[PDB]
């Protein structure tokens, strides 16, 4: 065994959470959270969740930790539980994620309404006056 | 294994080059002698974030086109894009995209 | 409280996503699908109290499949005893478990 | 947790006083530690040293209360040769109240504490005897 | 339940405790909620992938989206509070009391 | 008695079909009269809040208050009677189906029951 | 704000609560909670001032922490059984996480600290909304999983809520803080009967909502947020003060008023389960709520406080805007005790 | 008619990007409901075998089910080939 | 709870098909056309029994039939097949389109030698019927007996006796 690479990744995840949970110099806490997010993305990718890991790493990191850093700058045992068979000539994760439009019409409707309301709410809150 | 090794090689080469650049001129001796917080930048960041969230939902569209339910998938994709357009229109007409 | 609008209207707003064995895309099968199907068929209409007291065998099997704790315990026991024997020196692994076997397609 | 509850309750009431006193002391100390944690959270007085001093005083007060209650109640039950009597518990409660008054150095609180604690102790014994349920399970 | 799940759970617990500490800098509070949601995403993804439950592959993304939307609102709130005081200190929010 | 999960319960029916086998409440029911009285009180309070002659400001509005209260009260009484009828029906059926849990007491006269006597002195 | 945007936000809050109430999937319940929280903040910040912003940020922090805890409970429950349906939890740890999340959302002690401050910061209409409509979804979820709850924890939090509300209301001069502590005590009363009868929980919720609506609309009509401001109302609107006194008497649980219906019934229910001590303590503690209601009644309608000279000008004007349902709310909150058996309607 | 024509001419000047975007979006919404090749796309998606076709146990009452793929009975893909 | 029974190592010994995936892909269409009956027997047994231990002889049969198919290929047109598979093996995606000419030569050789017609598009994906004499498993899931349902009482509603009977209310 590669000395439990998943276990050491989870350990680095916990260590990073301890790192930014002390909340020193919120830029340093943000950087610790960025490292933790990268490590969690590595965990998900090594597990087999390529699309979900890349969604973490793109959306989470590149958008919202980026916006948090922007706002802050403006201010002052493994390998065992796994499967045996194969998937076919497609990836089950992509098909299941892909199925939301065909199957998850209700989820799409509620999520889109929530996002539009969120835009309206942000503008109203930041309106000022 | 290949991707981790490639990442490690890239980071190692970048680090080696930056440190040699930062220490090559350090061997020879030389002389060696606010508040404003504009609101519009936060708003453009938040708009990018809201738009980014919308982007994730579509991401599965390339795979969504093989379902045998083409009508429902097309309707929901167009609904999502229409709501993204409506968010853009609402922020446009409320002076949310101005400087 | 719970207003069962879906049952009254026959809508199926979110019931497609509640259990493993409910019409997955491309007929992909859940790992614990057989166990969950048996547990559901045991406990249908019986009610929660009687389901909890009477369908305990199927739920235990379903839980075991989901978490595999007893399988982990058995495998750990086997590995630990094998390690003890190899440390003592009275057991030798066969060529199959050392990578010296003849692989099959 | 209920581990201390079981440790206290398992000992027979009319015998073996020192373990009853020890168990009641531990229960009181745990209660005082919880109270000290809440007090530190809601009211951080000035610093670390005064906070640890306040925890020490609360814990020692509650432990002394529990020790005196257990010791006096068990001794009363033993000498009176009448177990399952709420009077023994009442006496223990009164003793506990007296100890609390001494710590606060108040005649009124000591007297007030003694009467109230004794009544509470008597009621707990009556509940043990009669099977009263503070937290009843859903029966009907 | 193997060690990876307990590691992610204790990561969530550490993030929750760090949020409940409130040294200062409400931005740190938002960061702690953010680490909480990240741990939730990781563990839900692991559970769903391990059990091959094909449909709930949707719900991590959705969770992310919703949580991310929440983050946006929080940032707005933080910003507005700063506009009143010039800093995002926790101790400035004592106008309302019990 | 939690009847939410009772079998054959249509989710959002105020009154099921079987409730039609029960006698409807009379229109002179005292509870209906109390509902009408509550509507009249609401009308008087509405007049008082608006600074209008309390007894004789709006007769149409007071009539509407009384009528709406009576209407809703009638339907509410129907539903209440139906639910109590279901409770009794289920209780009797359960007693009938489980005789071993409700054994018959042996009828015993006071002549051979010994009750302790306590004098008052 | 724009009336269109305000109506959209109100319907979004109601749709979130509705989403929570009609769904059978834990993810959809969580989504409904998220929608409700998202649309609730601008309502609290409808009138802009620093106090409202502080109240909104405190409310957001509390509700977001509760939502994260609730999602943790959902994921743990999924881990120990691959189920998404809202039913019995099947995990001891998950149930506790769920119970604490819902207690934080409801404002039950010891998670009560945010309610008085948020209520004081926001306006009267926002407070009406927060104290009436924002209790439906968590209580509905609690009713759905009542067979799972540990009675010890729920009853401990209920008794703590009753005690905290009773004691904290005694120290208040501000009307909104009085309403907040009253709501905390009433939530404590509601959650003590969940382990035994959810119908009594719903009956208590309905009676409390009726009384709270009446009291808030009376406070809005006579635009007072302090005791001394309310003490001036008799010199302009004595009938409003009389109605407010009767409503306060009802809220204190006096027979034959409507407020006596829940506690009585709840006590009765708790006696069928061989629980005697706990209802006794609950009633003795509700005496504190009655005391501060009576103090408010003394200051408002039972005595005539001094007035000012400018009040004369207010004698020449009448309210332009009226609440249509205020008389009905008053009558339903004072005079429905004879109709108690109607609770069989499984309200 | 005339007012609509005036509005479209006034928007086509000084706002051509918005006019083009709205026209393209409207076409993307409307045209799919009228195209006759949408059902062809659905049929093509149905004809893509991702899974093994599990045979059915013969019971003597299955005339439309083939015994061999070469048999005439069964779905054909000649419409796909001609496309 | 119980002992899991497994076949002996001798039961799992079979004459194996030792050709690579490029050869298999080159032959796949004619293999599906020719060796169909044992394959469908095996797969129907496999989805009906839901147990590998109950399908071993059918697997031996499909191995034997595949061996027979490849022996026929070897005997009549080894060279045409070899050239065709060389092309398939070269490509990383093993695309059929890349070497159409090799396939055409192979198709002509088999038809003349064995009269084999290559299946058309949409044929190998058909759902077909299998004539088998193996009995249908009556309890393939090994389920227990379902618990008895609740009594499901029925009757005709009557008014509640003496009303609600709640405290002092007479109705
Ligand atoms: C409805 C039915 C009818 C009902 C009728 C009404 C019934 C109720 C009314 C009668 C109640 C009598 C008791 C009331 C409480 C008395 C203590 C008190 O209130 O403290 C306030 C008060 C608080 O302390 P402080 O005011 O800060 O101290 C200033 C004193 O001047 C400092 O005092 P000092 O230092 O000079 O005292 C020295 C010495 C006092 O000793 C003596 O001088 C006399 C010794 C004999 O101290 C002691 O003895 C303490 C023991 O304490 C006192 O002032 C008096 C202390 C002496 C109390 C002696 C005991 C009184 C009788 C107790 C027995 C009766 C009740 C026992 C119940 C136990 C089981 C339930
Ligand atoms: C047990 C059940 C059975 C009994 C039921 C009891 C309840 C029934 C009624 C419930 C509510 C309905 C009325 C409420 C609206 C308010 C009206 C009002 O303000 O009075 C003025 C009004 C007369 O004044 P006005 O010249 O028109 O206008 C001047 C302003 O309105 C007023 O002039 P102002 O505003 O300038 O004067 C200021 C004054 C004005 O402020 C007020 O007086 C407001 C009234 C109190 C609010 C009531 C709250 C809601 C009711 C709940 C009651 C709880 C009962 C439970 C027991 C606990 C007791 C508290 O405020 C004060 O002075 C403040 C200090 C007073 C001390 C603290 C207040 C104590 C409150 C407790 C009252 C409870 C009994 C009230 C009885 C009805 C009062 C009219 O009174 C009436 O005429 C209405 C009385 C009812 C009409 C009956 C018509 C039927 C007769 C013919 C048909 C015969 C029937 C039989 C058929 C067979 C025949 C052949
Ligand atoms: C306040 C009252 C305002 C006026 C309301 C008029 C009716 C009042 C009824 C109240 C009780 C409703 C009820 O549940 O009745 C069932 C029941 C009486 O029904 P029942 O014994 O079959 O009726 C006997 C009649 O002789 C049999 O009567 P019937 O079947 O011949 O009915 C003809 C109808 C005649 O209709 C009319 O005359 C319409 C014109 C008036 O009855 C009446 O209107 C006259 C009464 O009442 C009770 O079980 C006891 C209720 C005790 C009071 C409720 C519990 C709380 C007590 C204090 C409440 C305080 C409230 C806040 C202050
Ligand atoms: C009936 C009551 C009407 C009044 C109440 C409305 C309540 C709010 C409005 C939102 C609820 C709309 C209900 C739609 C639920 C979706 C499920 C149902 O409609 O069937 C779907 C049909 O989907 C259709 O596309 C419906 C399209 C409707 C959505 C487009 C616009 C929705 C806007 C509603 C509000 C959104 C924000 C506000 C916009 C102005 C599934 O199609 P299908 O594929 O066969 O089945 C899938 C299962 N398979 C995979 C086995 C085959
Ligand atoms: C204090 C006064 C409060 C009054 C309440 C407001 C009055 C106005 C309401 C307007 C009419 C309401 C009727 C609704 C129409 C359809 C009802 C249907 O949708 O719901 C049914 C049931 O409707 C309600 O249960 C009946 C509401 C009646 C409330 C009155 C009882 C209040 C106690 C007595 C106090 C006196 C009040 C009378 C004077 C006005 C089926 O519910 P179900 O989907 O199966 O399960 C959900 C409930 N569970 C979970 C508890 C099981
Ligand atoms: C049914 C299809 C819907 C989906 C398609 C749309 C997808 C993306 C497009 C929408 C994005 C959001 C649009 C938001 C609209 C705001 C426009 C606006 O406010 O701009 C006005 C001006 O723009 C306007 O006039 C409003 C819209 C004008 C009409 C644009 C096209 C409308 C439809 C035309 C074609 C319709 C269909 C085809 C007809 C043609 C024949 C085929 C002011 O401009 P400023 O930059 O702020 O300041 C300039 C002054 N100093």
UniProtKB/Swiss-Prot annotation, chain A:
EC nos: 7.1.1.2
One GO MF term attached to the UniProt entry: NADH dehydrogenase (ubiquinone) activity
GO terms for cellular component: mitochondrial inner membrane; mitochondrion; respiratory chain complex I
Localization per Swiss-Prot or TrEMBL: Mitochondrion inner membrane
Gene3D superfamilies the UniProt entry points to: NADH-ubiquinone/plastoquinone oxidoreductase chain 6, subunit NuoJ (1.20.120.1200)
Membrane spanning residue stretches: 1-21, 25-45, 47-67, 103-123
Name this protein carries in UniProt: NADH-ubiquinone oxidoreductase chain 6
Organism of this sequence: Sus scrofa
Gene expressing this chain: MT-ND6
Swiss-Prot record, chain B:
Cellular component, GO, one term: respiratory chain complex I
Gene3D superfamilies (UniProt xref): NADH:ubiquinone/plastoquinone oxidoreductase, chain 3 (1.20.58.1610)
Compartments in which it is found: Mitochondrion inner membrane
Entry's transmembrane regions: 3-23, 41-61, 72-92
InterPro entries with a match to the protein in the record: NADH_UbQ/plastoQ_OxRdtase_su3, NDAH_ubi_oxred_su3_sf
Single GO MF descriptor: NADH dehydrogenase (ubiquinone) activity
Alphabetical GO biological process terms: mitochondrial electron transport, NADH to ubiquinone
Purpose: Core subunit of the mitochondrial membrane respiratory chain NADH dehydrogenase (Complex I) which catalyzes electron transfer from NADH through the respiratory chain, using ubiquinone as an electron acceptor. Essential for the catalytic activity of complex I.
Subunit note: Core subunit of respiratory chain NADH dehydrogenase (Complex I) which is composed of 45 different subunits. Interacts with TMEM186. Interacts with TMEM242.
Family: Belongs to the complex I subunit 3 family.
The protein's name: NADH-ubiquinone oxidoreductase chain 3
Native species: Sus scrofa (Pig)
Species classification: Eukaryota, Metazoa, Chordata, Craniata, Vertebrata
Curated annotation (Swiss-Prot), chain E:
Bilayer-spanning residue ranges: 1-21, 29-49, 61-81
First-level EC class: translocase
One GO term (biological process): ATP synthesis coupled electron transport
Membrane protein topology class: Multi-pass membrane protein
Protein name according to UniProt: NADH-ubiquinone oxidoreductase chain 4L
Functional note: Core subunit of the mitochondrial membrane respiratory chain NADH dehydrogenase (Complex I) which catalyzes electron transfer from NADH through the respiratory chain, using ubiquinone as an electron acceptor. Part of the enzyme membrane arm which is embedded in the lipid bilayer and involved in proton translocation.
Domain of life: Eukaryota
Keyword field: Electron transport, Membrane, Mitochondrion, Mitochondrion inner membrane, NAD, Respiratory chain, Translocase, Transmembrane, Transmembrane helix, Transport, Ubiquinone
Organism: Sus scrofa
One cellular component (GO) term of this entry: respiratory chain complex I
Keyword Lipoprotein tagged: no
Curated annotation (Swiss-Prot), chain G:
E.C. number: 7.1.1.2
Major location (coarse): mitochondrion
Pfam families per UniProt: NADH_dehy_S2_C, Proton_antipo_M
EC category: translocase
Top-rank taxon: Eukaryota
PANTHER family documented for this protein: NADH-UBIQUINONE OXIDOREDUCTASE CHAIN 2
Record family assignment: Belongs to the complex I subunit 2 family.
Subunit structure: Core subunit of respiratory chain NADH dehydrogenase (Complex I) which is composed of 45 different subunits. Interacts with TMEM242.
Record's protein name: NADH-ubiquinone oxidoreductase chain 2
Organism: Sus scrofa
